[PDB]
Amino acid sequence: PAGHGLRSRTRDSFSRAFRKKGTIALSTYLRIFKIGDYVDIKVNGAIHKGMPHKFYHGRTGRVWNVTKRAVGVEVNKQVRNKILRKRIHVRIEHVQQSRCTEEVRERIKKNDQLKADAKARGEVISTKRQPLGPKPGFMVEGATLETVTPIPYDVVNDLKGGY
Amino acid sequence: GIDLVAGGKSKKTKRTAPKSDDVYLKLLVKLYRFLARRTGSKFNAVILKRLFMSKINKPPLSLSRLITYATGKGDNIVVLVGTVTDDVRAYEVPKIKVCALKFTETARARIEKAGGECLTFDQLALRAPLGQNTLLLRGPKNSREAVKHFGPAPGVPHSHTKPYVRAKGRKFERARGKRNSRGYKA
């Protein structure tokens, strides 16, 4: 509306990948979606029903409802000075289960056991991750040294493969 | 130059004193300025702040609601920074010790008849300087006509805000925008 249709500017976004057209593999229809799961919205161009607006393509949201053929997804949308919680329904052909939280569950268990193993011995520790820190000092065994020097200029070589 | 906002100064406003000129209220403020400073009691600090508040921020508490919140707490002293009103819908009034800024004439009579006591905040300081064994209560702040008009505008979706109309009837904002048969319902 107001100068732009629903699918305006979707020539590339909503087109199928090269040599990946035709029948949709059935693993898409065997996925299980639960409330609270995170899903990435990826519009399939072949399915014209229950397809989200182009804005939600490439966005990750949280599942808040499950129907026969579609899942309700909560997606953040920035409008001026506010973030809106947009609730949309999308057919499962356009959603992929996201691996954004794949490390959380396995990390909690490791932290829980590490704290438990430390509680029994009365040693207070921290399970927090840390970013890459500075490396310690070390010795490197001597080896043959290859000398690098600037190369004399040659005009004939100022072209891919030369002139 | 320094990269701060408003030179690092606060842009928030709170009441540091009552706006009223009531001489008795100012004496109570002086009493509880001392109690809050020299005791560090959280009860005294809360009492001091509420004495500054405007009328709408000190809503009345009905006697019936006072009785329900005081059930099973006869030993405790009920404290209200506000006015206690009488409620004709309450039949049985147990004996209760209540401290409030003001009691309505009917509310005071019923409490005193039931063997209870109506206290002022200067009497409370003598009985509970740190607020020991007190039941601190507040009246309903948002139960008034003005609040019904606040929030999302009446015409936006999912709005139950009360509009401003000079009268009530079929001819006063019941047409287009208020039903599907007239354009839309909103």
């Binding site: 409802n65 309700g72 001026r80 000075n81 | -």
Partner: protein, 46 residues
């Protein structure tokens, strides 16, 4: 005619404001069949 100049600056004066997140979210718009059964389940809960 049109320009977005200064609009991001205006948005960031008091924003970006994220909506308040509560533990329980509204059930409006969810499957009525699921909601109706849930209401009965709570009714007979003991």
């Amino acid at each position: 005619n049109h320009t977005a100049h200064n609009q991001s600056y205006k948005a960031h004066r008091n924003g970006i404001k994220k909506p308040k997140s509560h533990r329980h979210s509204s059930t409006k718009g969810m499957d009525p069949k699921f909601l109706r059964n849930q209401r009965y389940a709570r009714k007979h809960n003991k």
